[PDB]
């Protein structure tokens, strides 16, 4: 019994720029590699479970949740509902300007509580191990860092591994998450081979991470800046009321308006 929770960063702006790029690799092969990974995960064992979430710019709508063309039947029904759900999601869509960068904290929150309720569903004989794949293709907004760390620590407590395939750009918070929870991070060097990366690195479960020789862990930067000038710090001043990082010593603490006792 295992539970893969794929999260696909469906930024319509990014994949729109990718489809106006007229490349080989568009959103169709992304969601198709997602579904082939999902059918492969349901295919490896009968007891496996699948859930696929799509972070849109303004909503975390889930994608998931006879045989006409020769598949296994539940794979056919799952593929039909994922296809119809992305067609209901992406085509019927909206336009706003203040909030156009994608989100990842909310979809991870839904994944965490979904794994919680599906672990309450589990009976006493069997036990559920779980992980969250994150297929990221956009640029994450900085503005939700306060939120984002929280879901990582939830996955630290709930023992949910986190994996990430980033497509275009590196992401410090997401390699940070895959460092904290014990998951895995991978930056793909060539787009259209995506599925073959997933079926060897991110398909294998927790009792095959230890068996397979995998690409090695990149060193993780624990950079830290002030809340003052945003510049890199090796020695900082941190308040004990506000609990905020200041770079240079200042009399009056700005973050919490503290009547600072001076010695």
């Amino acid at each position: 019994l295992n539970l893969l929770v794929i999260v696909v960063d469906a930024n319509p702006i990014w994949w729109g720029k990718q489809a106006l790029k007229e490349s080989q690799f568009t959103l169709s092969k992304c969601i198709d590699a997602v579904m082939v990974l999902g059918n492969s995960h349901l295919f490896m064992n009968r007891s496996n479970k699948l859930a696929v979430i799509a972070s849109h710019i303004q909503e975390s709508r889930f994608l998931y949740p006879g045989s006409k063309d020769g598949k296994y039947e539940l794979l056919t029904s799952a593929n039909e509902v994922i296809v119809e759900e992305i067609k209901d999601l992406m085509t019927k869509s909206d336009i706003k300007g203040q909030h156009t960068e994608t989100l990842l904290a909310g979809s991870l929150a839904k994944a965490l509580c979904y794994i919680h309720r599906m672990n309450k569903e589990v009976k006493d004989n069997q036990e559920m191990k779980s992980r969250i794949l994150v297929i990221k293709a956009a640029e994450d907004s900085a503005l939700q860092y306060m939120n984002f760390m929280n879901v990582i620590f939830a996955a630290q407590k709930q023992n949910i591994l986190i994996d990430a395939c980033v497509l275009d750009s590196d992401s410090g918070l997401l390699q940070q998450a895959c460092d904290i929870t014990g998951g895995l991070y991978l930056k793909v060097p060539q787009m259209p081979s995506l599925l073959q990366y997933l079926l060897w690195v991110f398909l294998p479960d927790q009792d095959q991470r230890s068996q397979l020789i995998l690409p090695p862990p990149v060193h993780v930067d624990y950079r830290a800046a002030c809340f003052c000038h945003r510049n890199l710090i090796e020695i900082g001043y941190v308040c004990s009321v506000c609990l905020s990082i200041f770079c240079n010593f200042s009399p009056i603490c700005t973050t919490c308006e503290t009547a600072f006792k001076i010695s």
């Binding site: 929280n150 710090i233 001043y237 941190v238």
Partner: protein, 366 residues
């Protein structure tokens, strides 16, 4: 001697079910959690004083009080280092009218839980000594810096508080030394511990059950709010990056450690003294700087922009959103929980999960 008459019956087919359901519902209860937008003491040298009295061997709990108390302190050290990373713990067993600093003030759960697994095997002979235990805790907690909310937690059982000197001058000193002492009591209320708790600044509590005692230690896990007395300083902090053996040890710096160690190739340095530490966060052993990886500041950011209350409504009540906004499931029970700002829908499982672990509303992020 006639408890057998507690089982009534009206139709007797579901009436025994009603009596069993009333009993099984009366055998459970819910917690009481408090919210505050107030200053908290987040660097927190807490210092645990356990009894080793004669009354620790009494069997009011299901094992004797020593064993249950020590088990819940193992859970306490676990959850306190799980929630506050900067802080430290020190453990004194108070035994035979004398006080014994069993484990010094440090910040990693391995040594403390190892010492508690050792301290299962003790004897618990004699009467306690609140004077000497508060003296050792004061002696170590004089010279921690002033922004630390210096806290002592006395898990105290017996009633004869056998001091060797006057313990109102200690309470006047500890009042002036801005320490904070909280006593969790067994079997009784004692006036001296009440004066100590209400004067030093702490809180006194007496124990019913296993569950109530877990609720009290869970109440003392969280950072308690500050008085109008504690210093609000600005501690100088250090953020050492991790350093592996540089480029296949091309001109590396092979060290042993800094506190049965092997040959360390790389790891964490210090930005003040340039020493070699394996684990982070560790207070600098030769400088006085405090070293922080900085998710260890992010592990305790939820205290500062905290949660709110869920509007709890049991009935059906206008619910045009049948599914859980948490995890997309139906609401098959009569408890629906609605947030304050976004006012989405959550069930009981999402309630316990959000309010205990995830610490944020999933709606308000969107």
């Amino acid at each position: 001697x006639x408890x057998x008459x507690x089982x009534x019956x009206x139709x007797x087919x579901x009436x025994x079910x009603x009596x069993x359901x009333x009993x099984x519902x009366x055998x459970x209860x819910x917690x009481x959690x408090x919210x505050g937008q107030v200053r908290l003491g987040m660097m927190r040298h807490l210092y645990v004083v356990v009894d080793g009295s004669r009354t620790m061997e009494d069997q009011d709990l299901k094992p004797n009080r020593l064993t249950c108390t020590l088990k819940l302190l193992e859970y306490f050290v676990e959850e306190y280092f799980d929630q506050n990373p900067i802080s430290q713990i020190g453990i004194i067993v108070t035994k035979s009218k004398r006080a014994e600093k069993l484990t010094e003030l440090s910040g990693n759960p391995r040594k403390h839980i190892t010492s508690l697994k050792k301290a299962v095997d003790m004897t618990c002979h004699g009467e306690p000594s609140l004077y000497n235990s508060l003296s050792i805790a004061m002696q170590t907690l004089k010279h921690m810096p002033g922004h630390t909310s210096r806290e002592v937690l006395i898990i105290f059982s017996s009633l004869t508080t056998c001091d060797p000197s006057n313990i109102y001058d200690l309470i006047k000193t500890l009042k002036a030394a801005k320490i904070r002492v909280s006593v969790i009591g067994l079997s009784a209320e004692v006036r001296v511990c009440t004066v100590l708790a209400r004067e030093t600044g702490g809180t006194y509590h007496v124990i019913l059950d296993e569950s109530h005692y877990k609720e009290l230690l869970t109440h003392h896990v969280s950072p308690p709010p500050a008085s109008s007395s504690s210093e609000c300083s600005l501690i100088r902090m250090g953020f050492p990056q991790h350093t592996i053996x540089x480029x296949x040890x091309x001109x590396x710096x092979x060290x042993x450690x800094x506190x049965x160690x092997x040959x360390x190739x790389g790891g964490y340095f210090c930005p003040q003294c340039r020493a070699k530490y394996c684990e982070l966060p560790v207070e600098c052993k030769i400088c006085g700087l405090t070293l922080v990886s900085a998710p260890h500041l992010a592990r305790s950011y939820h205290h500062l922009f905290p949660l709110d209350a869920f509007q709890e409504i049991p009935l059906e009540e206008y619910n045009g959103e049948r599914f859980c906004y948490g995890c997309q499931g139906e609401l098959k029970d009569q408890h629906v929980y609605v947030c304050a700002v976004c006012q989405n829908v959550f069930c009981v499982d999402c309630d316990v999960f959000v309010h205990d672990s995830l610490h944020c509303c999933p709606g308000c992020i969107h």
